[PDB]
Amino acid sequence: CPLMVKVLDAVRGSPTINVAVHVFRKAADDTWEPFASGKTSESGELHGLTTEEEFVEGIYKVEIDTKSYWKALGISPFHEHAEVVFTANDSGPRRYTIAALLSPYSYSTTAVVTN
Amino acid sequence: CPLMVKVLDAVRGSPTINVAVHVFRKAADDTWEPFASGKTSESGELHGLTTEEEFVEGIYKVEIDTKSYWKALGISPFHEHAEVVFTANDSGPRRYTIAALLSPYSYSTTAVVTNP
Amino acid sequence: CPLMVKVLDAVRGSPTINVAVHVFRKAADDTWEPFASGKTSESGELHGLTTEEEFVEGIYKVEIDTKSYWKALGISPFHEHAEVVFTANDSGPRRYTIAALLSPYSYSTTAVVTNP
Amino acid sequence: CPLMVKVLDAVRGSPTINVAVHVFRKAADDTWEPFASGKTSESGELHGLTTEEEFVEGIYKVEIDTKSYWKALGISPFHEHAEVVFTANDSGPRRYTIAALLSPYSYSTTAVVTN
Ligand SMILES: O=C(O)C1(c2ccc(-c3ccc(Cl)c(Cl)c3)c(F)c2)CC1
Numbered sequence A, D: 001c002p003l004m005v006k007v008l009d010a011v012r013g014s015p016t017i018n019v020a021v022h023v024f025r026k027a028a029d030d031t032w033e034p035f036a037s038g039k040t041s042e043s044g045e046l047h048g049l050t051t052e053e054e055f056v057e058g059i060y061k062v063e064i065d066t067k068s069y070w071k072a073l074g075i076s077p078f079h080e081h082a083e084v085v086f087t088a089n090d091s092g093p094r095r096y097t098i099a100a101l102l103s104p105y106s107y108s109t110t111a112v113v114t115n
Numbered sequence B, C: 001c002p003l004m005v006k007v008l009d010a011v012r013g014s015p016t017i018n019v020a021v022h023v024f025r026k027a028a029d030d031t032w033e034p035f036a037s038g039k040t041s042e043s044g045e046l047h048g049l050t051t052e053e054e055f056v057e058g059i060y061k062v063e064i065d066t067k068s069y070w071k072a073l074g075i076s077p078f079h080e081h082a083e084v085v086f087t088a089n090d091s092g093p094r095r096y097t098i099a100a101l102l103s104p105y106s107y108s109t110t111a112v113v114t115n116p
């Protein structure tokens, strides 16, 4: 599993459950081509987005649909989504975890990159 | 000054100086149209981006050129840039500060929305 | 003004107003001695805590009374308070801003150390 | 495992390995009594600090020795440590994960509290 996303809720002190995540890859014409999508589980994790064969070098965008998450809890948040844009696999295959912590008017994101 | 950006460096504990910031507005066709841009000052702030008359309700994207900032420091960064996408509304408190705290593999951002 | 504190609310997107902040200095016996205190202003800032003559090198603790802030908003918080413990040195850039961003179950803090 | 600590490094994009963690519990005289301690593993996690029987109600302080971590990597950081102080188990036993993200001049911490 070369690309995983884990999301926490800073208001309730819990995993962020059932947040939609869309991954895009920049094409030659510089548009964002849809690459993979899914929803976080009860543990706040999203596994199984892609495979090592499919996850080639490129510039990827991970979009976390935070507005839908807050609106479904009856909260009006500030951001449309949380986005993370990065070059991947440019020195060979790596494994990426995108971690995020969400508040209605704020988010933090970090990356854990292994072997 | 309805929209301001402030950027901090979590590695050096300093304002983020001379970093390019681009603001875009989402058009009817759903593309991002350039709206305003600048470079942060010695205090890490970018003022005077827009005016009240120009800053109408809609969806805006603030892009911070973090990759060039880290590279100028000889530091290898993770992100291509930091992006903040939000709706401006008139029922809200008028003045928007977008704040960001930068590390090579992480960033945090918050909005401070205040005042009459 | 060698030491300043600024506090932001990540739930409401606003400065954290009227929150108690206590500063302590570590004594020779290793206890924490009261040093300075105040409440944040309408802009979430606390200025005038100390002076250059009083703010000597040593270990300091800044305690932000976050629990009372959230309770006043009717919100159940996790932390008893937020604490920031650091050494002040004279080889460093003189002015210290302690910044904190608050959520009910989380806080982030950074230091901005600048200027002659 | 009712109390766990997980720490990430925002500079290197990796788990924070071998950071010391000390837990204290406030005594009746309001002093901080040592309660448990350990070091994070290669995954950045610290398990096995306490048991459900020992982890009674009280005010606990989790101190993450971030200065020793940065100094061992040849970096001079700002903070002495990162501290998290909270009341635990006041509505019955819960499981607590204290998560932290570290930079030389900054840290963030969040809590995940379950059942
Ligand atoms: O004038 C402001 O808004 C300042 C400020 C800017 C940013 C923050 C800040 C603090 C913590 C985080 Cl995680 C983030 Cl994203 C931003 C902060 F606490 C203060 C003090 C410089």
Ligand SMILES: O=C(O)C1(c2ccc(-c3ccc(Cl)c(Cl)c3)c(F)c2)CC1
Pocket (backbone or CB within 6 Å): A006, A008, A099, A100, A101, A108, A109, A110, B106, D006, D007, D008, D097, D098, D099, D100, D101, D108, D109, D110
């Ligand atoms: O298994 C993980 O990776 C977990 C985790 C997820 C997120 C973080 C985290 C903690 C703080 C910040 Cl600011 C950010 Cl962006 C992420 C954290 F410290 C830990 C513990 C749930």
